[PDB]
Every structure is written in structure tokens, then in C-alpha cells.
Amino acid sequence: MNNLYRDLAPVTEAAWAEIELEAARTFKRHIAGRRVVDVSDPGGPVTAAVSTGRLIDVKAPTNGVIAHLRASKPLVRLRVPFTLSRNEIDDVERGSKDSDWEPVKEAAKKLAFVEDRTIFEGYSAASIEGIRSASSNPALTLPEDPREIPDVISQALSELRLAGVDGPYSVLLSADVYTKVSETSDHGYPIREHLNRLVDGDIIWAPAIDGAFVLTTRGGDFDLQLGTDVAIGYASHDTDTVRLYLQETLTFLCYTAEASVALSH
Amino acid sequence: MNNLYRDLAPVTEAAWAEIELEAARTFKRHIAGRRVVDVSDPGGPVTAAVSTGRLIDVKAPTNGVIAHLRASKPLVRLRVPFTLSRNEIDDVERGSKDSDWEPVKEAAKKLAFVEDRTIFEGYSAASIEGIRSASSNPALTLPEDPREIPDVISQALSELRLAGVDGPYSVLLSADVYTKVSETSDHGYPIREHLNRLVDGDIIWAPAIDGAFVLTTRGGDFDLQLGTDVAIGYASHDTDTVRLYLQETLTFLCYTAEASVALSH
Amino acid sequence: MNNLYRDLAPVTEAAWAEIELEAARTFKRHIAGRRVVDVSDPGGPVTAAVSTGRLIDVKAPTNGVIAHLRASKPLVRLRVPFTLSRNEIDDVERGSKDSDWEPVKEAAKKLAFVEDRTIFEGYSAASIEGIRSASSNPALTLPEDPREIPDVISQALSELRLAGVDGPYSVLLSADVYTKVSETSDHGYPIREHLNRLVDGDIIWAPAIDGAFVLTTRGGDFDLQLGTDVAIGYASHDTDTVRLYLQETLTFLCYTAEASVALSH
């Protein structure tokens, strides 16, 4: 067995298939970051750091010796525990199709939110700079009126053009901004369609982020490194409940500072 | 023979083909529910209940015995009788093509209305909860002005997005609402086209329901179980008329509470 | 894995084989009901109800609609927990052949007693009518003197003959009555042999029932429906003991009211 200790969990095979399906579905729906960044293959469990290729000056060991430390970025392992009713698990073999997988959905939504907020806003404790912090283009303010959203977005499209950047540009919106441009309409279309006319990429719902992000998806600018992708593991169990977790280990690198514009309220 | 007792009816083969065609045509046109829900294969005449896979605590038979009843949902058989003129039946072999099949059309419309109102509004006596009652998303009020319909519908599309749900969304409208958004026009299109721009599913005419329903058609959320599909059976006859019926047996299950938004006036 | 969670139990393979053998042996010995009734194949875990083929009038959904609920009988799941010493389990691999399987035997005897008392005396909470309650033939009183038992039994054989019934008749006795007709002797034979001369079926020891039952085993009159047959499942464990259970899910149907005579004290 492995670190998931999956065979020790009192979960049947059919219940496991339903839990895997629910977690994978809810996660994909709430991920916006993997649609725009380069996603590496999983390095594996032993992978601990990503080389940046830079060098750090250290106090010379002896006379005439020049020493340099190799720089690297550590992976962070992110774990979201959740708790399942054993009655709901037992219902699945009897043929129930409405078993309560709400904790699985909440854990997948929380893991997806962490991953997206780590990619776009950073996680300083894990030495990850967000796309918002690593952007060299000027930051823009989103207006209160949703009918004035496409104007400011177009100004962001000016900045990537002034930065000398090609590629399909894509706009990612926070859930508040996505709702505002979805529910306001002008001439038989919502403002989301007006945003769709400005770019050759995609208007992407990004419920974890704040503000908005416009960026190129030409490739090679944004890199998500995975040691291991999302997995479900077993912690402990009692007569009534099974404690499990969702787990993934990653770091994020931004190679190109001028490939994005961040917007705030 | 079977329970339809079809060979006992004084109906010719050509008249039978015309009656089957008229009933099938009028039924499909008035069904909205089967276009969005999962429809099972017919179980057969012996099928009486659908297992839910849940358990019900019952008073222990003896000491040290733990007993549980298996929960299930009963099928309901729905029968709509109708009456045909025997002169109209006799006209068909002579080559008439305008035989009065209005009772067949009224029976098919009434059966379709029952089935759709059972799926969407429930039938408590048959222990069927409607989609409106089983929805966990908040209910919305449809405005008086049809030009304000697409706005509220978009708010419903917000709620399924806040519920974490994917899939093609589809909007079903009552006949009053469908007429209102069909006959009011803005900038060379009716409001029905404005609704069509908001979703990747279909604006569906649903004359049996009240209000409106927005829901995902990704699959596995809404399940119509059929023991036997719509069939035409023979009851009795006299010199002038033949009494027949339309008959179908079914139950409806909603597995996913957050996959729909109901709207009312 | 399944709902038994059998691989999670700290029970060795040899100990499992001994427990299965002990439970199966003790159960068969104490079952009288399966020797006389028709026993279906196991439906499976998803099976929840048995269709009776009857219809129940419900309040018409709308005008001109005739609705009927399909009638059915729910299965009941019967679980008898029991507790095993882990020292006795560990003794089996070392080669012990006297490991204490008394709790297994008591659980099998209790499960067999429940099943037989459910078949013959009913379980109202599970909507099961017993053979005694569903019999239309008159009930008889068993006399105090065992030498007068064969007389009354013969009167029961009159009643099935007056009911117009063929087939091998079989007599099932309670443990008190079986002991009384076993230990009293007349002319070199016990009274049990005198009972054996009256029928072409079998004198059957039925320790769970009260009184006596005489009935035909021609087939098609008494039907035991099994979703799942007797299985051993794992609940929980500590350093000293393993909690397991015996479990079976069933219902019982009596199709023929006049195929049996019940006797009481």
C-alpha cells in the first residue's frame, strides 16, 4: 500500500467510485488556473523542489574557494480533510443514488479555491509569488457599473499590447464580477458576451480570485509544477463516520512578468 | 392477449394505425419533461417499486435482533379514458382522412399534462416530490414585464453557478410565460431569442407547468422510472361508441437537490 | 470490498473457514421453514420490494385521470450481532480444534429462530402475515396427553382434505411437542413414528414455532423471497474481541390460504 492507506478505509468499491467521480467533477468545475497555465506532469512523491537555475553567494568555505548555493522552490502539500457518514457509504451498494457527498464537494471546492488563490494571489509562506504580485504591467481599477467593465478590460488589452506580447488572451473574472457581467444586459446580450467579443481566448469563471485577470495563453509564461495530483486518502474511522482527505502537492512559477494584467475593486 | 384487450375492440387495423399515430404525435409535442430528465427502459408489467437503497428502523422482532425495512418508491398507474365515435372509425377503411380524433388528442394532452405536472410539481399521494419542492436553490419571482424576464432567468443561472454545477442548462417555461416572451419583441427578436442567448441548452415549451424552471441536463440528476410506457387499451363498446384509454405507469426521482431553480409568479 | 467489510476484520483465513462452517451448520439444523416453503434465488442487494400485482386507489390527480398505486411488500434486513474472543481466533492457526464458537452458534440459532417465527407467526411491523394468521382452515387445540396427539393431527389432515388440496403433507412441531411425542412410547415406537405413519411428508422439528403446523408441500403455496441469503459481516474490533454479525434480508408471502392448519395449546 501507499500513504493514502486506501484499503484500510471502510469504503466499498462502488462508494469509492462515486466519491472519486464527485470529487473530480467538483474540482474541475472550480478550477480556472489549470486552463490558462502550463501544467507539468506529476514528478512523483519523492519530488521536493524545483530548480530555478539561479545561484546564491555564500561565505567562502576557505581561501580561494568560491561557493554558491543552488536556488530552488519548495513544493507545498495541501490537505483538506473531510468527514463522511458511514450510512451514506453503506447506501451505495444497496442501490442509492442520492448519497450525501456534500463533504466531498466542499473539500473539492476548498482545495480548488486554495490552488487557484495560490496561483493568482500567492502564498508567501510557501515562497510563491502570485500572478498579481509578479505582474509588471500596471494594475487597473474595475468600475462600479458593469456596463463600464468592457472599457477597462480593453485598457488591459492595451497594456499587453504595449508590453509586446502575442497569443490568445484570456479574461478570468471573480464570481462577483462574473455575476455582474452575466446579469446585466445590453441590446439582447449580457456584458459577458461583450467581453467575449474583445478576446480570442475565453471568458473564464474564477470564483476563488479577487478582481479580474487578463493574460496570454501562448505558453511558457506560467508554470504549475505538480509533485502529485489530487488524491483521496484515508485518515481514521469510527462506528458512524470515515475521516478522509483530499491532497495535492505543488508549486507555482511565473517566468514572464509582463504577460498579465491584474484588476481590483 | 394482454390487459389492453386490444383485439376485443371493434377497431380496424387502419383505424388503429391512425389512432396510434395521433396519440403518439400529440403526446410528444406536449411532453417537456422527458427532454431533460433521464428516462429508464420500461421495467415491465410486474415492476411495482423502485429501491431507494435506504433503511427504515423497525421495532426489534426479538432481543438482540436488529431489523430494518428496505425503503422504496411505488409506481403509479395513470389512466385517461376517452370515447370514440364508431362512425369515425368506420370512415377510415373507406378512405377518409379527416376522422375525428379529437378525443384521442385530448386524452394524449391530458396524460402528457399529468406526467409533466407530476415530474415538476409532484404528486404527494403517489409519494412523488416535484422538482420545485425538491430544489434546494432559492425560488425566484418572475416579473410582470416580459422584457425583465431574461434578467431574472440570469439570476437563476447565477444560483446553479453558486451551487457548483456544470452541464448544458435548459430553461422550461409555462405556456403563459412562453407566450409572453414569444409575442414581445426587442430589436428585431422576440425575448425567447434573448433567453436562447443565455444558455447552451434549449428554451423548452412546457404548457403543463407553472412558472419556469432552469436546470442542468448533464445527466444523472433527474430520473423518470417507467414500468410500462404509454399504451392504448380497450374498456368497453356500444353500437355508437368505443371507450378506450391511454395508460402509463411511472414514478419520478430527484437525486440532486441543487440542480434546478424554480420560478413562480 | 462490500458492506460486510470482511477484509477489515482481524480474522485469519482458517478462522474464517471455521466460523463459516459453524454458522452454516447451526443455521441449517435450526431451520424448518425452508424445508417446506418455496425459496427464491437471492435478488441481490438492490432488491427492496416484491410486487404483489395488486392496485391501490388514490385521489385522482386531475379531472378525468384515474390513478392507482402499485402494491408491494418491503424486504426486512435482519441482523444479529455477536462477539468473538480474539484469543480463540488466534488459536485456530496454531492448530486448535476446540475454539469457542458458542457466540457464532447462538447468533445462528437466534437468526434461524427469527426467520422461522417470521414465516410461521408473522412480523407485523414488516407487513408479513404468518402462516397461522393467513390460514383459512380452522385452528385446532393440541391435547395434554401426547398419546392423543396423532388423533388431533389426523383431524387437521381431514381439513386439508375438505379444503380440496393434494400433495405430500408435512407436520412441523414445536420443540415442546416434538419432545413430548418423542419421549412417550406406545408398543415399541414413540408417538413421532405414529405421526410418521399418517403422512407421506416428514415430521419436522421446528424449535422456533409454537404449537404445530400441518401443510402441503406441493409447491407454489408459500414463498420466501430473499434479497440476500445469510452472510457474516464485520462491525468493529478491540484488543480482545471482534464484533461481527449475521445478516439476511427477506420477506415472506403466503399465496394459498387453505394450504395449512395451525395448532395451539
Residue numbers in the entry:
A (entry chain G), B (entry chain FB), C (entry chain A): 1 to 265
Any passages from the paper?
Encapsulins are a class of BMCs characterised by their conserved subunit (Enc), which self-assembles to encapsulate enzymatically active cargoes and can remain porous to cargo substrates. The overall structure of Enc subunits across species with different T numbers is conserved and consists of a peripheral domain (P-domain), an axial domain (A-domain), and an extension loop (E-loop). T = 1 encapsulins of Mycobacterium tuberculosis, the causative agent of tuberculosis, and the closely related Mycobacterium marinum, are known to encapsulate the DyP as a core cargo with iron storage ferritin protein (BfrB)28 and FolB as possible secondary cargoes. In vitro cryo-electron microscopy (EM) single-particle analysis of the Mycobacterium tuberculosis encapsulin was used to obtain three structures of the encapsulin shell in intermediate states, as well as a 2.3 Å structure of the fully assembled shell.
To study the structure of the encapsulin shell at near-atomic resolution, we overexpressed and isolated M. tuberculosis encapsulin from E. coli, which has 92.5% sequence identity (97% sequence similarity) with M. marinum. We used 89,072 particles which were found to be in the fully assembled state, yielding a 2.3 Å structure of the complete M. tuberculosis encapsulin shell. The encapsulin shell forms a T = 1 icosahedron and has an inner diameter of 19 nm and outer diameter of 23 nm, measured along a fivefold symmetry axis. The icosahedral assembly of 60 copies of Enctb can be described to consist of 12 pentamers, 20 trimers, or 30 dimers. The dimers are formed by the interaction of E-loops from Enctb subunits of two neighbouring faces, forming a tight interaction. The M. tuberculosis encapsulin shell has multiple different pores; single pores are present in the centres of each pentamer (9 Å diameter) and trimer (6 Å diameter) and two pores are present at the interface between two Enctb subunits within the pentamer (9 Å and 5 Å diameter). We did not find a clear pore at the points of twofold symmetry. The diameter of the central fivefold pore is relatively large compared to the reported pore size of other species, such as 6.8 Å in M. smegmatis, and 8 Å in M. hassiacum. Overall, the encapsulin shell structure of M. tuberculosis is similar to T = 1 from other species, with some species-specific variations, such as the relatively large fivefold pore diameter and the rotation of the distal section of the E-loop. A notable difference compared to M. hassiacum is the absence of a disulphide bridge between Cys134 and Cys254 in the M. tuberculosis encapsulin.
